């Protein structure tokens, strides 16, 4: 009894089988009368007065009912030719078979191979009979089943009996094939940027490319921003280009009156593909005119939110035992603080794998990179890395132990050190060589037990795991930190062999990692539950030479890191997740999160989640400005709730609410309602979100927003209630965690 | 025809959109990715359904 079934109830269906002139009359230029039935192919003609002329043509008079596998005709006068496959039916009505279109006319013609439906002074509507919500009555209408369109001449769009629109020419996409025309328009009011309006226009260039021009009129700025999109599908992959361009900004001229022009633009290019299974091309490029572009056209209040734009290219060549890649990675920082950043121009990655060298496995990894800074005072360097590896994996049914040896060799050539050295104590070096091995031992076991006491046919496992990592200590204070950052340690991250992501900081390690996992499988060998607990024991302090992390305790050795996980799959609808991260040097819980969700189907779902991040974790990792600002220093502690429920199978209510318990103030709040019908659909949305910080008053500012969509239905095979598109319409979008 | 049957001559956005049938390349997929919006200070894309025929 869903919307697809309700709108299909009034739709006629074809009963005869899908595959010749058999007449059937009571009284048989032969004239027939009473009640006739003419079957030629899949077509049928019904009337009470049909006569032949031969030479074979028929003339029907009175209560003519033409039937087909595509249309249905009714009228008081008819005429057809049994050789040209044409029918002329006078004033009456028609209705599509197997779909929703219908309307009336004065002269309806069927044409070549029953493909055209020529209409004179007719109308076309997509609603079910007895609704008459909207119609597109025009002078002439042409329906064709191949291109799936309805061309209308001298069209007058009507809502009810009111001709709200007039146009010389118009096309409606009656089907699923792509066609160029106007898409769904949007209306929106915001407490920051005021009234807005979008008018998309599609363009079907070719089967493998299309464009979309979207004039976006913002009232506050007094000009239209042209949002352009171009999608393509070539032999090298598929991508798209975005070019938004605002010729003049009246708000920007007030903030920055010294600039000659106030134009605003943004260019985004994204590409991703693989050609011939070897070549791998990737692009992710973003460029904007001014640093305040992302604040203005995101409904942001002030220039306080940090961020950057990523401008990456890549070309690769992958084989089963080798892959080489060249890539340049640049960024553009948009903070009020220092905006200097490094970029790799270019970077080369080479890998080579050769298995079965006896009982061992072999691997080689090389890299050659060049670092440049936007400023002309910061150092720049060239780095070359080599990393041969050797394994020895042994395994059986109940356990497996793997022993790995590795060697690390890096070379540096640093220049532009005059400014940095002249005002710092630890001088940098022109040439640095950093060679150091690595030895790791990993082990696992698995046990099983038949837990018939609790449930019949279930089984439970227990998988203890241990590891030992040893890396020697090399002083790295004379190497600038270009692309190394501290890594997070979830349960599976306890067994990682790196602390920093990059090659400029490689901390010494002398530690043993221990963990355990316990899974529960049901009688169908389907896993339902699993929980993991792990830790790291440091035998000696992990030193990276620099050693400039702001810890809370002066703890160096012992059990310092803990982590855990949980995933319970109660039923097909329920699902619970968890995770905690404890660090003794923080004397607190670093990070934690949880989530419980019920989801009967797409429309019906409830979800509760939690996110935590301690004040000490913000201090240890994020910059020194995040430990003193009132909008950063408290960490994260928020509770979220997402829900959805449809009523009467046409409505759909959606809500969301996120609440920061530290400040006792909300962070996000959403509420969307969409009424889906057989020939239209209306959506309304609301959202209150944080959009900046007021330094003068020391409290956050919010940004309200209420939208309004409208859409035509029945032309395409779409009957969704729009729940999944409303759930992702807020700054903290819904994510399926089932 | 150089490459054998089923060889994915072009893969786009995680799905194969062209494969060798017998000495010739034929389309075997579709790609539907659209511009999503600004993710802080950058662009993004969203996949509205890409499948292999």
């Amino acid at each position: 009894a869903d919307l697809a079934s309700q709108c299909m109830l009034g739709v006629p269906s074809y009963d005869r089988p899908l595959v010749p002139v058999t007449i059937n009359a009571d009284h048989a230029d032969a004239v027939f009368t009473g009640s006739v039935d003419i079957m030629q192919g899949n077509s049928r003609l019904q009337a009470d007065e049909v006569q032949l002329h031969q030479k074979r043509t028929v003339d029907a008079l009175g209560n003519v009912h033409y039937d087909d596998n595509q249309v249905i005709l009714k009228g008081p006068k008819g005429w057809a030719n049994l050789n040209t496959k044409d029918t002329n039916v006078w004033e009456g009505d028609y209705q599509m078979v197997g779909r929703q279109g219908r309307g009336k006319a004065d002269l309806m013609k069927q044409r070549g191979e029953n493909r055209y439906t020529i209409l004179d002074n007719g109308s076309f509507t997509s609603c079910l009979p007895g609704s008459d919500t909207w119609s597109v009555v025009g002078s002439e209408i042409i329906h064709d089943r191949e291109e799936q369109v309805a061309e209308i001449w001298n069209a007058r769009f009507k809502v009810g009996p009111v001709p709200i629109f007039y146009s010389p020419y118009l096309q409606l996409p009656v089907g699923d094939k792509r066609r160029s025309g106007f898409l769904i328009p949007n209306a929106k009011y915001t407490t920051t940027n005021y009234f807005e309006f979008y008018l998309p226009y599609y363009w079907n260039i070719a089967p493998n490319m299309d464009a979309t021009i979207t004039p976006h009129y913002m009232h506050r700025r007094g000009n239209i921003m042209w949002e352009n999109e171009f999608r393509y599908l070539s032999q090298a992959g598929a991508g798209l280009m975005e070019l938004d361009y605002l010729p003049s900004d009246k708000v920007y001229e007030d903030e920055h009156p010294n600039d000659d022009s106030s134009r605003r633009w943004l260019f985004y290019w994204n590409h991703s593909g693989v050609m011939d299974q070897v070549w791998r091309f990737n692009v992710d490029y973003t460029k904007v005119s001014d640093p305040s572009y992302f604040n203005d056209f995101d409904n942001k209040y002030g220039s306080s939110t940090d961020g950057y734009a990523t401008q990456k290219f890549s070309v690769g060549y992958a084989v089963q035992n080798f892959n080489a890649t060249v890539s340049t990675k640049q960024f553009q920082v948009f903070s009020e603080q220092n905006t200097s950043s490094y970029s790799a121009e270019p970077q080369l990655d080479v890998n080579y794998y050769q298995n079965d060298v006896g009982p061992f496995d072999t691997r080689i990894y090389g890299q050659a990179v060049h670092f440049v800074n936007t400023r002309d005072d910061m150092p720049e360097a060239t780095r070359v890395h080599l990393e041969p590896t050797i394994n020895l994996p042994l395994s059986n049914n109940w356990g497996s132990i793997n022993t790995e040896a590795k060697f690390l060799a890096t070379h540096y050539q640093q220049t532009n050190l005059d400014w940095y050295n002249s005002r710092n104590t630890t001088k940098l070096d022109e040439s640095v060589n950093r060679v150091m091995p690595q030895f790791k031992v990993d082990g696992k076991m698995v046990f099983e037990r038949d837990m018939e006491m609790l449930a019949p046919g279930y089984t439970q496992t227990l998988e203890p795991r241990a590891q030992y990592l040893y890396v020697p200590y090399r002083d790295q204070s004379d190497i600038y930190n270009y692309d190394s950052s501290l890594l997070q340690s979830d349960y599976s991250g306890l067994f990682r062999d790196r602390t920093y992501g990059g090659l400029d900081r490689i901390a010494s390690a002398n530690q043993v990692t221990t963990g355990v996992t316990s899974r529960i499988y049901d009688d169908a060998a389907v896993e339902r539950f699993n929980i993991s607990v792990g830790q790291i024991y440091y035998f000696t302090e992990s030193r990276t030479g620099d050693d400039n992390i702001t810890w809370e305790n002066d703890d160096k050795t012992g059990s310092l890191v803990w982590a855990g996980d949980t995933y319970w799959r109660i039923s097909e609808r329920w699902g619970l997740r968890g995770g905690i991260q404890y660090d003794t040097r923080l004397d607190n819980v670093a990070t934690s999160n949880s989530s419980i969700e019920y989801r009967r189907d797409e429309d019906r779902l409830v979800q509760l989640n939690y996110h935590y991040a301690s004040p000490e974790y913000i201090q240890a990792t994020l910059p020194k400005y995040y430990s003193t600002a009132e909008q950063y220093k408290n960490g994260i502690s928020q509770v979220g709730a997402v829900a959805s429920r449809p009523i009467a199978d046409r409505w759909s209510i959606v809500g969301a609410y996120y609440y920061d318990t530290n400040a006792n103030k909300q962070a996000d709040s959403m509420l969307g309602v969409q009424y889906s019908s057989c020939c239209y659909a209306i959506r309304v949305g609301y959202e209150r979100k944080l959009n900046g910080w007021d330094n003068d008053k020391q409290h956050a500012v919010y940004d309200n927003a209420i939208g309004f969509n409208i859409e035509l239905r029945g032309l395409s095979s779409n009957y969704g209630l729009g729940t999944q598109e409303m759930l992702r319409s807020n700054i903290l979008p819904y994510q399926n965690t089932l | 025809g150089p490459r054998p049957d089923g060889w994915c001559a072009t893969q786009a956005s995680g799905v194969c959109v062209a494969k060798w049938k017998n000495g010739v390349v034929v389309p075997a997929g579709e790609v539907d990715v659209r511009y999503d919006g600004i993710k802080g200070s950058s662009g993004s894309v969203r996949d509205y359904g890409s499948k292999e025929w």
């Binding site: 409606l172 699923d176 025309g181 979309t212 | 072009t10």
Partner: peptide
């Protein structure tokens, strides 16, 4: 009125 849809290679 138009109909946005997925891209594909020409036949």
């Amino acid at each position: 009125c138009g109909l946005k849809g997925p891209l594909y290679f020409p036949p």
